[PDB]
């Protein structure tokens with residue numbers, strides 16, 4: 154049982170040690186498309202790249218590249234697209250990806266500005282009457298409604314394909330209270346947020362995979378997917394304590410590098426799953 158594993162690692166202060174063994178054991182696959190000189194300006198960070206085998210391709214003939222990965226969790230029957238916070242020049246590619254993959258939800262785990270720098274382009278409209286048009290990808294995005302709560306904001310958006318005049322409703326889930334440094338003290342509001350995403354139908358197999366991002370698409374984004382998958386496997390299995398969070402993280406790391414950026418994010422992921430298991434058992 155992970156709860157006893159938690160106390161052992163905590164009492165021995167072994168988090169940095171566990172974390173390094175995960176780093177050591179993590180998969181390494183080629184990222185040749187990401188490294189092509191012409192894709193430099195499509196990448197936020199030079200050391201955060203999608204693997205070629207799991208990368209999302211845009212259906213545009215010129216350049217199919219976006220910094221996004223498909224994470225397929227076969228036993229849990231859950232998929233996720235993890236991506237970076239869009240750049241000023243990739244906002245149109247972002248929405249094209251949402252469209253092409255039939256996603257119903259976008260999960261954002263960062264503020265546009267943190268530590269006095271921009272972590273992400275403002276890629277959705279701030280007012281109903283001021284819609285956004287992405288001329289490069291022929292999409293229009295309208296804010297329909299915005300529900301602001303203490304720890305998160307939910308937005309209903311309308312995405313229109315200007316080429317075919319089809320429209321879809323997209324839900325934007327914006328977790329607004331992740332602190333600038335470290336991790337939340339309590340996983341309560343994060344779990345509350347994760348259950349709200351689940352309740353929306355955004356994680357359901359009827360729809361395309363949910364799009365999840367922070368700034369790099371590996372740290373906070375990693376914590377979200379890791380907690381969701383671990384809780385789902387505990388519902389599914391004959392023995393819920395067969396779930397090993399380290400094995401699940403390593404399976405997820407076959408699809409995108411660097412998921413869970415610090416030993417504190419790892420400790421927080423354990424705390425979230427342990428606390429979430431109480432509300433599921």
Ligand SMILES: Oc1ccc(CNCc2cccs2)cc1
Nearest residue numbers: 192193194195196197198199240
């Ligand atoms: O216009 C832009 C200029 C640079 C960047 C960041 N690129 C980071 C790097 C990726 C690969 C090698 S260096 C984004 C937009």
